[PDB]
């Protein structure tokens, strides 16, 4: 059973990560992420949404999933990995 690794770009353009789905989830639920935050799922395994290794806003990740439970990261791994 696979857990994803994620990166994100801050407002100074620095790349942080890779951080696990669980970590990303916690920060999401913590309210730390803006919907404008550019994030990326690392292409460590195949996945059915089609977001491996691309940078998209958190808001766009959610438009693609069309439904989330507690957070888009956990949802992604559950539904697409």
């Amino acid at each position: 059973s696979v857990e994803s690794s994620w990166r994100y770009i801050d407002t100074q353009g620095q790349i942080h990560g890779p951080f696990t789905t669980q970590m990303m989830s916690q920060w999401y639920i913590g309210g730390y992420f803006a919907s404008t935050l550019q994030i990326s799922r690392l292409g460590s395994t195949p996945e059915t949404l089609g977001i491996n290794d691309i940078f998209i806003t958190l808001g766009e990740l959610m438009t693609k999933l069309e439904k989330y439970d507690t957070d888009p990261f956990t949802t992604f791994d559950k539904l697409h990995v």
Binding site: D10, H16, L37
Partner: peptide, 7 residues
């Protein structure tokens, strides 16, 4: 506790 680079 906050993610690095975001505040």
């Amino acid at each position: 506790a906050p993610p690095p680079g975001l505040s």
